[PDB]
Amino acid sequence: QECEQLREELNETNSETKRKKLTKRIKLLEAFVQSGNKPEWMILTVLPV
DNA sequence: CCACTCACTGCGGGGGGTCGTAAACCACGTCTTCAAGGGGG
Numbered sequence: 001q002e003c004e005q006l007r008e009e010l011n012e013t014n015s016e017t018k019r020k021k022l023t024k025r026i027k028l029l030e031a032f033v034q035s036g037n038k039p040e041w042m043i044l045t046v047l048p049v
Numbered sequence: 050c051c052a053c054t055c056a057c058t059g060c061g062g063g064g065g066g067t068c069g070t071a072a073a074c075c076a077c078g079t080c081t082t083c084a085a086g087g088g089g090g
Contacts (some may be wrong), residue, residue, distance in 0.1 A: 015050085
């Protein structure tokens with residue numbers, strides 16, 4: 001849903017800096033979607049030794 | 050309104066008193082095999 005909203009307002013917006021920021025954000029979101037990693041795994045609950 | 054910096058950041062060259070357990074044994078002992086010797090040049 002975040003990707004959908006970002007795509008819509010990217011198609012809507014006219015400012016170029018917003019376009020660059022949102023294309024970076026969309027790249028990150030699609031990377032998470034395709035890779036399979038979960039976002040919450042960046043917070044550690046088990047620490048290896 | 051988005052232009053146009055500029056400050057910013059990151060990158061290379063202290064007392065005592067009890068308790069339980071893997072150490073920590075000195076007696077414990079009887080077993081082994083230490084065996085004195087035995088005969089066939």
